[PDB]
Ligand binder design. Structure first.
Ligand SMILES: COc1ccc2c(c1)CCN=C2c1ccc(S(N)(=O)=O)cc1
Ligand SMILES: [Zn+2]
Length: 258
């Protein structure tokens, strides 16, 4: 009886195995844009992905992960709210059964069709595993997806999904360049939060870009052909793998822009 996104194992049940689900800095949240304050002392955000080296793509039974070789000083996030340097380890998405839902963060209660999470660990802690024992161990760059024009730089991900249709399948995926998934602007909101899947650890500085990327309906329809299930098991389409907004509990959300 593993956690998931269904009636009997979804987000309203996670607190039993993971009581931090009711913690003081859980994610995602609704971003109330009028209450977020501009912070002129945020330094510029720096996203340096030119030497990112992807290994592999994986269906882990809740989403798919695009993995990176994080053994060298490559693909780093710094600046903004962050002290020092954070190294990219993986990205994944959350998405809906319908274009009208799928994001985890919301913006004045608006749900986007999906949300990309680029996950980075603070290099002061040596690797991901020690970073997730720290309150400033991780930084996740979140990017909303809306349905409209296609995102050309997403198509190599879309096309490999047929080979990891089911849980536990992976495929070599070298030379994927995550620069092709960014929007033009790096304006963002930031707040302290958590992982949005079990174990829900409260390690994350969230950086959520204001500008969404556009993906086509056909691209997100191929996300929705994935399966929660393994090969040979009955089909449960991988859709609605998002956690809803959690209580803000007096945290403050800061804006990088006026
Ligand atoms: C070792 O590399 C990992 C990459 C990702 C995870 C783990 C390990 C352990 C299980 N948790 C994650 C994870 C990362 C990001 C998120 S999210 N949705 O907060 O970005 C959720 C879970
Ligand atoms: Zn995520």
């Amino acid at each position: 009886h593993h956690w998931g996104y269904g009636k009997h194992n979804g987000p309203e049940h996670w607190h039993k195995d993971f009581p931090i689900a009711k913690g003081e800095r859980q994610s995602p949240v609704d971003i109330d844009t009028h209450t977020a304050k501009y912070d002129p002392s945020l330094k510029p955000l720096s996203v340096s992905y030119d030497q990112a080296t992807s290994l592999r793509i994986l269906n882990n039974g809740h989403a798919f992960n695009v993995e990176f070789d994080d053994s060298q000083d490559k693909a780093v996030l710094k600046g903004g709210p962050l002290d020092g340097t954070y190294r990219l380890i993986q990205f994944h998405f959350h998405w809906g059964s319908l274009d009208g839902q799928g994001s985890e963060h919301t913006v004045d209660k608006k749900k986007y069709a999906a949300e990309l999470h680029l996950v980075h660990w603070n290099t002061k802690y040596g690797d991901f595993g020690k970073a997730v024992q720290q309150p400033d161990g991780l930084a996740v760059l979140g990017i909303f997806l809306k349905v409209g024009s296609a995102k050309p730089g997403l198509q190599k991900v879309v096309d490999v999904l047929d080979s990891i249709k089911t849980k536990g399948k992976s495929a070599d995926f070298t030379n994927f360049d995550p620069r092709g998934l960014l929007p033009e602007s790096l304006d963002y909101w930031t707040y302290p939060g958590s992982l949005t899947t079990p174990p829900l650890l409260e390690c994350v500085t969230w950086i959520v870009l204001k500008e969404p990327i556009s993906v086509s309906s056909e691209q997100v329809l191929k996300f929705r052909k994935l399966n929660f299930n393994g090969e040979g098991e009955p089909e449960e389409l991988m859709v609605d793998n998002w956690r809803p907004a959690q209580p803000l509990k007096n945290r403050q959300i800061k804006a990088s822009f006026k």
